[PDB]
Ligand binder design. Structure first.
Ligand SMILES: Cc1cc2nc3c(=O)[nH]c(=O)nc-3n(C[C@H](O)[C@H](O)[C@H](O)COP(=O)(O)O)c2cc1C
Ligand code: SF4
Ligand code: SF4
Ligand code: F3S
Lengths: 158, 1472, 117, 116
C-alpha cells in the first residue's frame, strides 16, 4: 500500500514479557515481530526527502528503501538492500541505542507522532532471512596472492 | 495595434473606400503605446489599388504619351546619408528592369512632411521614391505581374551582392501600392499628402498598425506587406524556416522557368515572422493557386473527428495537412490576391475579427466593431469569425463568399476524396502481422549491465516508471529543485539534462491540453516531403502513424514494410580509440549517412545495439543532431526519414528533445525490456502486459502533448527539428555546429568532457561485477547520491538559530552554506572592491534594509490557514510587504485584531483562474500583481488535489467541495501585449492608489519582453528563477524547465538601460536566496527588492518532507486536515528574527566592502570577478555576458520617481463629476451619455468609489443607472458592484462584464435597426471572465469562450460560439440558439439550458464531465420561465417574446446540462 | 541588439578553435562615455578583447600567419551572414591598436588602460 | 429610503407669505421672488373654499373651509428701493442661495429689468 500511514496508526513495539517473569531467566526481554504487525509498523514511514533517519545513523543504511521493500512483501530484496551496507545488521538492531541515533531523529518523531520502529524492523527483516538460507558467505572468485593480519576479534576486527 | 480591410462587393472603384480606410486608421490610437514626446510612433501602413488616372496625367504633364494598358509603379527606399549609394541603386534597378525590355518612364519624388516625425524615427529615415515602368510588349496582365515579381527578386539579389544597406522595395506591381512608415496612425495622411488627392480611388483597402516591444524603429519592418497583413505572432518560425530550407531543393514549376534558379533562397535574412510568412505566401500564390487555397494550405483548420462536417472538407483538410506543415500561432490575417480579398483566422481563434455589410455593397472588417462610423439603418448583417473560419470577396466577379459557401466552392476543383485513399495506416500492418517472431528477453545480468552503463538508478523505476505503467500519468513532486546544474555536477548526468525547455510569456499564450485536446494532433508521416508546387495523386502516397513513439512490435512491422530501402547506421565508438574517438565516430556516421542517401536509401535507422564491453554508445541526441544537420546542409534531408533506436529513453523529456532535434520516430526498447522484467516478477498485480504497454505509451503521449503545449504549438509536424530548447553548459562551437538553432549564452564543455564522462561510466559498468543498481539521489536526498542545497545539518542549525535567537549560530549556518563546493552560477562570482573598509555602525539602519525584503505569495490552498496568517502577521510587524498569492483571501481578516495584529496582506495577486478576485478584494491592498508564469512550473497552471478542497476553501473560492481544481495554462485575457496594457489600465482604474507588478520567469529573450512590458505603464518587474518551490506539480516541469535568475536579471537590466527606460521601473528577484552574500550579489546585478520564500517556511517548522501534495505533512505547514493542523509550532517572532539576522549580515558585508548604503552598490557590476574551480575540472564557462556594463548616461541606475505611472482618463471622470448627490446626499441618479469605441473600462472608477463608500452590497439594485448609445470600448463595466446598472444601445467590443461583482449590464440593438436579433453578433470574446455575482442580458450572439470561469453570474444570451461555457463553476446560463464545438468543457458546477431547434447538441457537447437531459421537474421549469421573463422585460426582445408565447410546445426543445459532480449535492434531484 | 553579439562571438570562437589554439576568454575594455559628443555616440560600437594563447608550441612567424588567416576567415564568415557593425581592429601576438572617434587629447581619458604603469 | 428626495431646490416668496418661515428659506439652494404670474398679471392667486382640506389648512396656517385669495400687491415692495431692501433681506437670511425675480412680458419691461 501507499506507505504514509502514520496518520491513522499508532506506534507499538513488539511483544514484551512482564517484570515478575523477566527477573528469573537470562534470555531476552523482547520478541520478534509477527508478519502482519511488521508489515504495519514498517508502513508508518513517510519516504521523506532529506531523511534524518540516515544522516544520524553511523553506518548510514538506506533506511527508507528497505522500509519500503518491507511494506510490500518482497522481503528478500529488502534483505539484500539492508545487508549490502552493514555486516552485522541483527546485532546492531539488538544492541544499538536507537533513541539517540535513528529513532531519536525521525521526522515524524520530531513532530510528537512517535518514531518509526527502525531497529526492530532491522531485526525482523534480517532474522527471517536467516531461516530460509538467503544468507551466503562471500567467497572470493579469484584468490589473490596476498596475506593481511589483524589484531583482535571485536566488531572492527571481524 | 490592429488590422482592417474594406472592400466593395460588386467591384467598382470609388473614393469612399479610401476615405473610410483613412477614417478607420484615425481611430486606433487608444491601443498603441503613448509616448511623452507626442510624435514618436512605431509603425503604420495602408495598401490600396493604383490610381491609373493620377500617374497617366503625371506622364502626360511630363511630356510622353499616355499608354493604352495599365501602368506599373514601384515604391523604393534608398539610402539618404551618402549621395553615391543612391546612384548605384538607381543604376542597378535600371539595368535589371531594362533586361526584360520594358520601357521606363522615369522617377518621381514622393512629397513628404518631416515636421511630424519624432527624433529617433527621423535619424534613420530613408529616401522615398517611385519608378514608373510601362508595358510596351503587349503581354497579358498575369505574365506582366510574373515578370515584375521576377524582376523584384533579381533586383533584391543583385543589391544584396554589392552589400548595400538601407535599401527596400515596398511594392512593385501593376495592381496595388503601399504607403507605410514609422509615424503615428492619425498622421498618415499628413506625412503622405498624395492620399489627400481626389483621384485616389480603389475597390479595396487594407490598413495595419503595430505595437513594438523596443524603441529602435526601422522603416522596412512596417506592415502591410505585399499580399499579406498580419496581427499577432507566430510561434513556430525556427522550425518552419528549417523545413523551407529542405523544401527548396526540390521545388520547380514551368511558370517561372529557368529564372527559378534565382528564387531558390526564398526566405532571406533580416525579416520578421510576418515577413517570412508573407514571402512564402507570395511565392505560392504566384505559381497558380488562389489566395483561399494558399491560406488553407498554410494555416489549415482543426481536422476534427466529429460528424459535424461533411467528408469533402475532411478530405481537403487531410490533403492540405499532408502536403505542408502548418504555421501555428495567434494570427488574424487580412490578405489580398490580385483578384480575391480574404480575411481569415488561425486554428485556435485567439485574436478577434468582426465584419459588417452595408446596403451599398460594402464590407468592412477589423479588430473592433466601431472604427468606421456607419448610420445605424444601413447594416444588413453583422458577424464574427470563429477558429479557422474565413470570409472572401471575389472582385472580378463581384461576389461574397462566407465560410460554408467558400468551403463548398473550394471542395469542387479537384477530386480530393479519390486522392486521399492512397495513404496507408499502421494498425492494419500490425494486425496483419503474424503472431510470430517474438524474440527472447535479455538476461537479468545483461539488463543490469546495460542499465548501469547509462546511469539508471533504482529510483527511476520505483518513482517515475511505476506510476506510468500503473495509472497512465506522470509523477508529481511538491517542492522546488535544489540540485546542482549539469556542468557543475560531479555524477554522470545524461546529455539531455543540459537542455532547458521553452515557454511563452506575455507575447504569446500557452495552450490548454486537458480540455482543448481536440485541436492537437500527433500525426507522423513517412514518405511525405516532395514538390510543394504540384497538385496530383502522387503527393498523398505515404505511410501514416498515429504517434511518433513506437513499440518494438510496431517497429518491426514498420521495418518489414520498409524493407530494402532502409540503411542501418552504427552509433558506437571504440573505447580504445584514443583521445579523439568520439569526433572520429561522429565524422564516420555523418559521412556514411550521406553516402547511403545518395545510393537510393530512403530510410535511415540509427541504432546502437552494438554496445558491448569494447564499444561505448554515442549519446543519441548528439548523433541525431549531427546527422540531421548534415542532411539539411547537403540538400538530402528532403529524401529520407530519421528513425532512432535509443537505450537511454525512459522519461518524457528524452523523447521531447529527440523529436525537437529532428528525429522522425523514436523507439525505446530498454524501457520495454525493463517493464517486462518487472512484470514477470509480479509487481503490477493482475494486469496483462499489453495493458501495461498501452498505459505507458498513453502516458508518454500525454507528456509529449504537455511539453508541446507550453509554447503554443498544437501540431507535431511543425515542432520537429526546430530546436525549441536552450542549452546551458555546452560550448558555443559545439552547439553552433551540431544543433540547428539554439543559444548557449555561456560556453561550456566541448567534446572531450562528454567523452571522458561517457568512458568513465562505461568502464565502471563493464569492468566491475555489478550485482544491483545504486539507490541514487536525484529527487530525494541520499548519502550516495548528489549534493543538495538543503541538507539536514543546515536545516537544524537554521531552526536553532531562529528559535533561540543567537546571531552566532546564524553565522555558523551561513558559513556552512557558503563552504560547500560550487553548485550554482553565483558560486563562481567573487566580490572585490578597491576602497577602504568603514565601521559597521556607519551603514544604514536595519529597519531601512528590512523594508526591502518581501515574502512571496503562497496560496491558502497549498498552505494552511495558520501558516498563511502567521506569515502575514509577521511581515506586517517589521514594516515590509507580504503576499497572499492566488486562491483569494478571507474578508474577516480585513481589520486589525484586538491585540494589534494585522492579518491582512499588502500584495494581492491576479492569477489565471481569478479564484477570489472581487471588487473588494482589490480595494484592500497597496500593490497589485499579475502572475504570468511561476518559477517551478513555467507555462502551466497550479493544481489542487480533490481532498485538499475542504468546505472553507470551497466557500472561499466559490467552488464545489471535493473536486480537483487545476488552473488554465493561458490567461484568456492576455493574448498579446496590447491586452496586457488593457488589463493594467483596468487594474489601475479599479484601485487608484496601488502599483501593478508583472511576474515573469528567467529565460532567453526576456529582454525584449521586459522592454515591452515597461511601455505598458507597468512599474514593478519580478524575475523569478528555475529553483522556486511549489505546492504540487509534475517532476519534469520542476527539474527540466527554467533558467537561473543570474541570466534573466542581468539581461533585463541591460536591455532596460539600453532603451533609456530603467529610471521608471523597479526590479525584484527571488528563488534560491539563503544568505546575505546572495542578496548583495543580486543587488549588484541590478535588483532592488528581494523575495525569500522557502527559507521562511523552514523558520516556521518545515523540514523539507516533500509530501505537500499528499495532504499529510507531519509538522502541519501545508495541510488541510484538522488533526495534523493541531501540530503547528509556528510563531511570528521566528520570522522576525530570521529577517533581522539576514539584514545584519548584509550590513556586515556592505561595511566590509566600503559603502554605506545599498543604493551605492546597485548596478555596479564591475565589483564582481569570475574565478575558476581549478585546473582539474576544465569547464570553459565565461560569465562575462552578465558582467558587461552598459553605461547609463544622465539618469541613475535605479527607479527615481515616486508614485505609480499615471494613465489617461476615460469617461468615468465626468460621471464622478455629475453623480455627486449619490456620494454626498445618498440618492438615486440617472445619467445618459454617448459611448465611443475609444473609451475603455466604462464604469470601473465609479465602482471603486461605491465600494469604498458603501461596500459591495450596500445599495439596492438599480440605484445608479447609465445609458450609452453607440459602440462601447473594451472591458465595459469591469468589476461593477451591485447598485450600478449600465444600458448600452448598440454593441460592445470585448471582455464585457469581466470580473463582475454584483452589477447589471444590458446590451440591446437600437430601436431603429432592421436586424434579426438572434442572427447578428452583439458582444465579443471572453464575456463574464471570472464573474462572482450579477446579471447580464444580451439580445444577440456572443463570441468565443463565452462565460469562462463563471462563479455566480447569471446570463441570458441569444447565441454563442466555440468553446463556450468552458470550465464554469457556478451560476445559470441560458442560451437561446446554437453553440460551437467543445461546448461546456471542463465544467464542474452550475447549470445550463440550451434551446436546440435543430437537435444538434449531442454532436457539439463535450460529454465527459456533464450530462444533458430534458426538463422533467417543474421547479426547474419555473426557473427558466422567470429568467426568460426577466430577459424580455429588460431587453424588450422579440425572439424571447415568441418563445414565451408558445411555451407549452417549446418547453420540450430545451436541453438541461448539469455537471456530474453536482448530481448528488443539489437540493431537488433532476430525476424523479 | 543583444543577439547579434552572440552570433559574432560564436562565429569567432568556432573559427579560432578550428586551428587548435586555446581560448582564455573575453574581457571588456573600460571606457568613459562622458567625453564623447552626441553624433559620435549614437553609432558607438561595443569594444571587447579576446585572449588567445598558443599551446601547439609553433614558432612566432607561423603563429602570426595562422592569426592572419583566422582573421580573414572570420571576416569572410561574418560577411556571409550579413551582420553590420562588426570590426577587428587587430589580432596579433605583437601589437595592439587603441583608436576611436574622440578628440586627440582625450585619448587617454576614454581609454584608462593606457594610464597603467 | 429609495434615495428619492422629495425636496425642492427652488422656494417661492409669494405675495401672501402663506408658509414662509425661517426653516423654509434655509432648506433650498436657489430662491425666487414672484412679482406677477403669466396667466393673471397684476392679480393674486385664488383657492376655493372647499379645496382647503385640514392638511392644507395646517400647512398654510389658516382656517379650514375658507376661501384664500392672495393680495394683489406685496405690502413690502412699493418701489425699487423696497425691492433692493427685500433682496438684501433674502440674501442675509440664506447665505448660500441666489435670488430670482419673475416678471411678465410687456412693453417697458426693459427699463424695469435694467433697474432690478
Ligand atoms: C508551497 C508553495 C506554494 C506556492 N504558491 C504560489 C502561488 O500560488 N503563486 C505564485 O506566484 N507563486 C507560488 N509559489 C512560489 C513563490 O511565490 C516563490 O516564487 C517561491 O517560493 C520562491 O522560491 P524560494 O523560496 O526558493 O526563493 C509557491 C511556492 C511554494 C513553496
Ligand atoms: S523514519 Fe521518518 S525520517 Fe526516517 S525514512 Fe521514515 S519518515 Fe523519513
Ligand atoms: S539500529 Fe540499525 S539503523 Fe538504527 S542506528 Fe543502529 S545500526 Fe543504524
Ligand atoms: S516539505 Fe512540504 S509537506 Fe510540510 S514539512 Fe515541508 S511544507
Amino acid at each position: 500500500q501507499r506507505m504514509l500511514g502514520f496518520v491513522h496508526t499508532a506506534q507499538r513495539m513488539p511483544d514484551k514479557r512482564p517484570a515478575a517473569e523477566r527477573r528469573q531467566d537470562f534470555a531476552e526481554i523482547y520478541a520478534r515481530f509477527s508478519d502482519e504487525r511488521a508489515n504495519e509498523q514498517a508502513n508508518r514511514c513517510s519516504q521523506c526527502g532529506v531523511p534524518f533517519c540516515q544522516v544520524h545513523c553511523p553506518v548510514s543504511n538506506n533506511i527508507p528503501d528497505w522500509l519500503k521493500l518491507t511494506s510490500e512483501g518482497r522481503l528478500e530484496e529488502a534483505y539484500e538492500v539492508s545487508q549490502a551496507t552493514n555486516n552485522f545488521p541483527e546485532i546492531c538492531g539488538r544492541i544499538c541505542p536507537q533513541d539517540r541515533l535513528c529513532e531519536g531523529n525521525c521526522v515524524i518523531e520530531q513532530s510528537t507522532h512517535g518514531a518509526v520502529t527502525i531497529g526492530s524492523v532491522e531485526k525482523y527483516i534480517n532474522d527471517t532471512a536467516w531461516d530460509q538460507g538467503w544468507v551466503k558467505p562471500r567467497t572470493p572468485s579469484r584468490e589473490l596472492g596476498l596475506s593481511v593480519g589483524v589484531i583482535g576479534a571485536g566488531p572492527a576486527g571481524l | 495595434c490592429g488590422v482592417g480591410f474594406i472592400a466593395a462587393i460588386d467591384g467598382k472603384p470609388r473614393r469612399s473606400v479610401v476615405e473610410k480606410g483613412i477614417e478607420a486608421l484615425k481611430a486606433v490610437w487608444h491601443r498603441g503605446a503613448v509616448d511623452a514626446d507626442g510624435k514618436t510612433g512605431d509603425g503604420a501602413g495602408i495598401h490600396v489599388a493604383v490610381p491609373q488616372k493620377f500617374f497617366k496625367d503625371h506622364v502626360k504633364v511630363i511630356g510622353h504619351r499616355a499608354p493604352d494598358n495599365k501602368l506599373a509603379v514601384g515604391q523604393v527606399f534608398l539610402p539618404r546619408i551618402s549621395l553615391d549609394a543612391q546612384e548605384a541603386c538607381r543604376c542597378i534597378v535600371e539595368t535589371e528592369i531594362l533586361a526584360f525590355g520594358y520601357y521606363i518612364y522615369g522617377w518621381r519624388q514622393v512629397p513628404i512632411n518631416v515636421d511630424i516625425i519624432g527624433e529617433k524615427a527621423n535619424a534613420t529615415r530613408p529616401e522615398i521614391e517611385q519608378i514608373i515602368v510601362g508595358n510596351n510588349k503587349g503581354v497579358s496582365d498575369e505574365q506582366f505581374e510574373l515578370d515584375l515579381y521576377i524582376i523584384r527578386r533579381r533586383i533584391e539579389k543583385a543589391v544584396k551582392g554589392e552589400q548595400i544597406n538601407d535599401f527596400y522595395i515596398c511594392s512593385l506591381s501593376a495592381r496595388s501600392i503601399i504607403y507605410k512608415g514609422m509615424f503615428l496612425a492619425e498622421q498618415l495622411t499628413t506625412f503622405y499628402p498624395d492620399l489627400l488627392d481626389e483621384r485616389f480611388e480603389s475597390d479595396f483597402a487594407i490598413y495595419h498598425q503595430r505595437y513594438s516591444t523596443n524603441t529602435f524603429p526601422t522603416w522596412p519592418l512596417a506592415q502591410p506587406f505585399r499580399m499579406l497583413a498580419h496581427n499577432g505572432e507566430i510561434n513556430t518560425v525556427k522550425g518552419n524556416v528549417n523545413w523551407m530550407k529542405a523544401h527548396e531543393t526540390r521545388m520547380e514549376h514551368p511558370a517561372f522557368g529557368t529564372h527559378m534558379q534565382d528564387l531558390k533562397p526564398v526566405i532571406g535574412v533580416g525579416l520578421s515572422d510576418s515577413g517570412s510568412l508573407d514571402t512564402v505566401f507570395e511565392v505560392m500564390v504566384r505559381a497558380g493557386r488562389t489566395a483561399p487555397m494558399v491560406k488553407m494550405m498554410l494555416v489549415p483548420q482543426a481536422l476534427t473527428s466529429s460528424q459535424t462536417t461533411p467528408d469533402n472538407h475532411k478530405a481537403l483538410i487531410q490533403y492540405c495537412n499532408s502536403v505542408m506543415e502548418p504555421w501555428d500561432g495567434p494570427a488574424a490575417l487580412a490578405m489580398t490576391d490580385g483578384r480575391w480579398v480574404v480575411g481569415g483566422m488561425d486554428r485556435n481563434g485567439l485574436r478577434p475579427m468582426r465584419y459588417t455589410i452595408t446596403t451599398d455593397g460594402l464590407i468592412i472588417g477589423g479588430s473592433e466593431t466601431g472604427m468606421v462610423k456607419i448610420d445605424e439603418t444601413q447594416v444588413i448583417e453583422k458577424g464574427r469569425l470563429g477558429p479557422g473560419e474565413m470570409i472572401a470577396v471575389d472582385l472580378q466577379s463581384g461576389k461574397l463568399y462566407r465560410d460554408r459557401e467558400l468551403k463548398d466552392h473550394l471542395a469542387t476543383l479537384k477530386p480530393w476524396d479519390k486522392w486521399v485513399q492512397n495513404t496507408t495506416h499502421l494498425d492494419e500492418l500490425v494486425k496483419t502481422a503474424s503472431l510470430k517472431g517474438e524474440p527472447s528477453d535479455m538476461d537479468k545480468a545483461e539488463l543490469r549491465r546495460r542499465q548501469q552503463a547509462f546511469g539508471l538508478t533504482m529510483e527511476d523505476m520505483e518513482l517515475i516508471l511505476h506510476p506510468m505503467v500503473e495509472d497512465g500519468k506522470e509523477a508529481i513532486g511538491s517542492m522546488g529543485d535544489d540540485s546542482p546544474i549539469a556542468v557543475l555536477s560531479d555524477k554522470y548526468r545524461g546529455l539531455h539534462h543540459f537542455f532547458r525547455q521553452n515557454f511563452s510569456q506575455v507575447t504569446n499564450p500557452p495552450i490548454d491540453s486537458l480540455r482543448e485536446r481536440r485541436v492537437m494532433s500527433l500525426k507522423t508521416r513517412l514518405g511525405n516531403l516532395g514538390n510543394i508546387l504540384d497538385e496530383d495523386e502522387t503527393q498523398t502516397r505515404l505511410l501514416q502513424l498515429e504517434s511518433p513513439v513506437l513499440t518494438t512490435a510496431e517497429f518491426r512491422a514498420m521495418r518489414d514494410y520498409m524493407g530494402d530501402t532502409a540503411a542501418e547506421i552504427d552509433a558506437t565508438f571504440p573505447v580504445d580509440g584514443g583521445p579523439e574517438a568520439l569526433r572520429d565516430a561522429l565524422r564516420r556516421i555523418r559521412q556514411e549517412t550521406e553516402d547511403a542517401v545518395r545510393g537510393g536509401a530512403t530510410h535511415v535507422i540509427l541504432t546502437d545495439e552494438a554496445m558491448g564491453p569494447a564499444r561505448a554508445a554515442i549519446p543519441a541526441i548528439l548523433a541525431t543532431g549531427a546527422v540531421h544537420t548534415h542532411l539539411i546542409r547537403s540538400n538530402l534531408r528532403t529524401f529520407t526519414s530519421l528513425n532512432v533506436r535509443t537505450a537511454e529513453g525512459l522519461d518524457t523529456h528524452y523523447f521531447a528533445v529527440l523529436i525537437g532535434v529532428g528525429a522522425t520516430t523514436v523507439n525505446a526498447y530498454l524501457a520495454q525490456e525493463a517493464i517486462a522484467e518487472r512484470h514477470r516478477r509480479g509487481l503490477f498485480g493482475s494486469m496483462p502486459l499489453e495493458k501495461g504497454m498501452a498505459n505507458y505509451k498513453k502516458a508518454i503521449d500525454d507528456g509529449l502533448l504537455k511539453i508541446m503545449s507550453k509554447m503554443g504549438i498544437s501540431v507535431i509536424s511543425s515542432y520537429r527539428g526546430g530546436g525549441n530548447f536552450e542549452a546551458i553548459g555546452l560550448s558555443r562551437a559545439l552547439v553552433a555546429e551540431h544543433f540547428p538553432a539554439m543559444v548557449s549564452r555561456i560556453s561550456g564543455i566541448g567534446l572531450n568532457g562528454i567523452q571522458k564522462k561517457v568512458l568513465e561510466q562505461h568502464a565502471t559498468a563493464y569492468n566491475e561485477e555489478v550485482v544491483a543498481l545504486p539507490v541514487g539521489g536525484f529527487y530525494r536526498f541520499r548519502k550516495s547520491g548528489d549534493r543538495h542545497g538543503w541538507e539536514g545539518g543546515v536545516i537544524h542549525t537554521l531552526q536553532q538559530a531562529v528559535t533561540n535567537d543567537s546571531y552566532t549560530t546564524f553565522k555558523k549556518y551561513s558559513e556552512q552554506v557558503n563552504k560547500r563546493p560550487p553548485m550554482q552560477l553565483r558560486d563562481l562570482l567573487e566580490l572585490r572592491s578597491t576602497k577602504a573598509p568603514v565601521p559597521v555602525d556607519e551603514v544604514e539602519s536595519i529597519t531601512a534594509i528590512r523594508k526591502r525584503f518581501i515574502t512571496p505569495g503562497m496560496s491558502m490552498g497549498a498552505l494552511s490557514p495558520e501558516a498563511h496568517g502567521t506569515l502575514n502577521v509577521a511581515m506586517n510587524r517589521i514594516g515590509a510587504k507580504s503576499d497572499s498569492g492566488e486562491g483569494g483571501e478571507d474578508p474577516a481578516r480585513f481589520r486589525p485584531d484586538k491585540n494589534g495584529d494585522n492579518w491582512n496582506s499588502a500584495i494581492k495577486q491576479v492569477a489565471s483562474g481569478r479564484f477570489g478576485v472581487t471588487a473588494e478584494y482589490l480595494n484592500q491592498c497597496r500593490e497589485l500583481e499579475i502572475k504570468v508564469a511561476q518559477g517551478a512550473k513555467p507555462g502551466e497552471g497550479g493544481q489542487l488535489p480533490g481532498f485538499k478542497v475542504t468546505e472553507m476553501i470551497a466557500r472561499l473560492r466559490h467552488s464545489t467541495p471535493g473536486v480537483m481544481l487545476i488552473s488554465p495554462p493561458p490567461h484568456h485575457d492576455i493574448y498579446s501585449i496590447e491586452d496586457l496594457a488593457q488589463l493594467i489600465y483596468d487594474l489601475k482604474q479599479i484601485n487608484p492608489d496601488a502599483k501593478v507588478t508583472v511576474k515573469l520567469v528567467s529565460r532567453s529573450g526576456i529582454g525584449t519582453i521586459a522592454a515591452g512590458v515597461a511601455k505598458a505603464n507597468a512599474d514593478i518587474i519580478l524575475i523569478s528563477g528555475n529553483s522556486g518551490g511549489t505546492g504540487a506539480s509534475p517532476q519534469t516541469s520542476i527539474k527540466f524547465a527554467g533558467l537561473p535568475w543570474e541570466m534573466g536579471l542581468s539581461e533585463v537590466h541591460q536591455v532596460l538601460t539600453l532603451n533609456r527606460l530603467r529610471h521608471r521601473v523597479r526590479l525584484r528577484t527571488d528563488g534560491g536566496l539563503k544568505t546575505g552574500r546572495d542578496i548583495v550579489i543580486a543587488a549588484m546585478l541590478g535588483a532592488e527588492e528581494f523575495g525569500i520564500g522557502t527559507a521562511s517556511l523552514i523558520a516556521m517548522g518545515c523540514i523539507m518532507v516533500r509530501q505537500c501534495h499528499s495532504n499529510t505533512c507531519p509538522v502541519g505547514v501545508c495541510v488541510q486536515d484538522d488533526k495534523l493542523r493541531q501540530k503547528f509550532v509556528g510563531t511570528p517572532e521566528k520570522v522576525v528574527n530570521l529577517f533581522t539576522f539576514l539584514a545584519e549580515e548584509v550590513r556586515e558585508i556592505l561595511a566590509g566592502l566600503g559603502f554605506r548604503s545599498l543604493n551605492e552598490v546597485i548596478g555596479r557590476t564591475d565589483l564582481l570577478h569570475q574565478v575558476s574551480r581549478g585546473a582539474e575540472h576544465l569547464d570553459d564557462l565565461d560569465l562575462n555576458p552578465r558582467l558587461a556594463q552598459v553605461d547609463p548616461g544622465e539618469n541613475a541606475r535605479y527607479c527615481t520617481l515616486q508614485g505609480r505611472n499615471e494613465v489617461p482618463d476615460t469617461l468615468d471622470a465626468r460621471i464622478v463629476a455629475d453623480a455627486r448627490p449619490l456620494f454626498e446626499e445618498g440618492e438615486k441618479m440617472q445619467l445618459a451619455y454617448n459611448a465611443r469605441n475609444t473609451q475603455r473600462a466604462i464604469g470601473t472608477r465609479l465602482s471603486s468609489m461605491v465600494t469604498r463608500k458603501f461596500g459591495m452590497f450596500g445599495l439596492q439594485p438599480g440605484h445608479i443607472t447609465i445609458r450609452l448609445r453607440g459602440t462601447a470600448g473594451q472591458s465595459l463595466g469591469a468589476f461593477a458592484v451591485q447598485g450600478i446598472k449600465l444600458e448600452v444601445m448598440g454593441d460592445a467590443n470585448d471582455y464585457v462584464g469581466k470580473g463582475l461583482s454584483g452589477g447589471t449590464i444590458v446590451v440591446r440593438p437600437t430601436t431603429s435597426s432592421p436586424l434579426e436579433t438572434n442572427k447578428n453578433t452583439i458582444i465579443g470574446n471572453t464575456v463574464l471572465y471570472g464573474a462572482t455575482a450579477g446579471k447580464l442580458f444580451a439580445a444577440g450572439q456572443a463570441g468565443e469562450r463565452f462565460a469562462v470561469r463563471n462563479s455566480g453570474a447569471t446570463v441570458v444570451v441569444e447565441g454563442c460560439g466555440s468553446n463556450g461555457c468552458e470550465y464554469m463553476t457556478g451560476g445559470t446560463a441560458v442560451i437561446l440558439g446554437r453553440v460551437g464545438d467543445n461546448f461546456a468543457a471542463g465544467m464542474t458546477g452550475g447549470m445550463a439550458y440550451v434551446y436546440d431547434l435543430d437537435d444538434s447538441l449531442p454532436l457539439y457537447i463535450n460529454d465527459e464531465s456533464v450530462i444533458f437531459q430534458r426538463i422533467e421537474v417543474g421547479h426547474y421549469e419555473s426557473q427558466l420561465k422567470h429568467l426568460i421573463e426577466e430577459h424580455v422585460t429588460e431587453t424588450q426582445s422579440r425572439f424571447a417574446a415568441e418563445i414565451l408565447n408558445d411555451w407549452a410546445r417549446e418547453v420540450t426543445k430545451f436541453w438541461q446540462v448539469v455537471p456530474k459532480e453536482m448530481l448528488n449535492r443539489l437540493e431537488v434531484p433532476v430525476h424523479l
